[PDB]
């Protein structure tokens, strides 16, 4: 049967935030079967410098499970596979996610004691999924913000969050932020609207 | 706290008897539990010995070894935590062999020729492992052949054929091998070797 040097594939970049496990995928096709080693800065992993790492091997892929603790844990990692015929390496970048960019408020439609805030999702998730939205509102000329959190799926599927407990004939400012696993993102500018009588 | 959010490639490729992992990455707090389904059956099942589940903190992997055409198609990942539930569907695609390479040029010498080609437009979903070239003198019966690791063939998309006779017209054609098997043979390309002196 057909022998060949290992052929590797997997994503270019993998995103996470400090303290959060993520797996880097190294899929391998080789005959005869290959031995897979993971490297960073020339050393086999886990190493002294990169110690927050476990490897999960399966017949079709090796997974490097990395839990970054510091800035230095982000950067390039290498999967190398070796068999009788030769070797191949694939380089991955572990990227530090950002929090999301700001949602944009499109329109606010006030509905006695409530308001429907129509919004556009952040232009950038920061590399990991948006999990929730936070809305904050306050009557114009108050300092204290009221807030409510919304699941990101329900919110994004209609592009609306509904704000509640509003007083009639009152001008409010409302602003919106998106939360991903790393934390809360940039908060939108506040938009003003007035509730009905 | 939020209901689970799930991520992963929609389509996963393999051929009968070959294990592949379907990846379901999960973001949830509190931690979620992933369940897998195939044609309404909750896995693992005595009904499905060709399927193993490999869990890691950040992702569950369904290791499937298709034993028949009936094993391809949809698999569903679901995740549940205290807050809610999410599901993501995957398609396990049966890989094809590669489409045909295309021969662009042959640079002939006297007893050898360099054959330049474009790789198959479609790999069939699993990587190309090797190439097979075949060639035949215009008046002879046998197609001669040679195999090449795609690692070398793929560097320039050039392979060298050898054992040719001078001042002789040949056809050459090429096919690519992947894990599923040997793909479509290219259209033949005509060339003539240089004369002696």
Swiss-Prot record, chain B:
Keywords: Cell adhesion, Cell membrane, Disulfide bond, Glycoprotein, GPI-anchor, Host cell receptor for virus entry, Host-virus interaction, Immunoglobulin domain, Lipoprotein, Membrane, Phosphoprotein, Receptor, Repeat, Secreted, Signal, Transmembrane, Transmembrane helix. The chain holds residues 414 to 609 of 858 of the full protein. It comes from the Eukaryota. (Microbial infection) Interacts with rabies virus glycoprotein. (Microbial infection) Interacts with Zika virus envelope protein E. Glycans are attached at residues 21, 47, 76. GO terms for cellular component: cell surface; collagen-containing extracellular matrix; cytosol; external side of plasma membrane; extracellular region; Golgi membrane; membrane; neuron projection. It comes from Homo sapiens (Human). Disulfide bonds join 24-77. The gene is NCAM1. This is Neural cell adhesion molecule 1. The keyword Oxidoreductase does not apply.
């Amino acid at each position: 049967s057909h022998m060949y040097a290992p052929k590797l594939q997997g994503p270019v970049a993998v995103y996470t935030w400090e303290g959060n496990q993520v797996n880097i995928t190294c899929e391998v096709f080789a005959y005869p079967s290959a031995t897979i080693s993971w490297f960073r800065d020339g050393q086999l992993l886990p190493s002294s410098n990169y110690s927050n790492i476990k490897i999960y091997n399966t017949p079709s892929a090796s997974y490097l499970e990395v839990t970054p603790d510091s800035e230095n844990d982000f950067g390039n990692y290498n999967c190398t596979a070796v068999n009788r015929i030769g070797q191949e390496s694939l380089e991955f970048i572990l990227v530090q996610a950002d929090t999301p960019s700001s949602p944009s408020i499109d329109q606010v439609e006030p509905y006695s004691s409530t308001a429907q805030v129509q919004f556009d999702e952040p232009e950038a998730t920061g590399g990991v999924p948006i999990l929730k939205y936070k809305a904050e509102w306050r009557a114009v000329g108050e300092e204290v913000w009221h807030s409510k959190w919304y699941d990101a799926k329900e919110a994004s599927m209609e592009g609306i969050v509904t704000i509640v407990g509003l007083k009639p004939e009152t001008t409010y400012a409302v602003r919106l932020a998106a939360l991903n696993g790393k934390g809360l993102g940039e908060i939108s500018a506040a938009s003003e609207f007035k509730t009905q009588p």
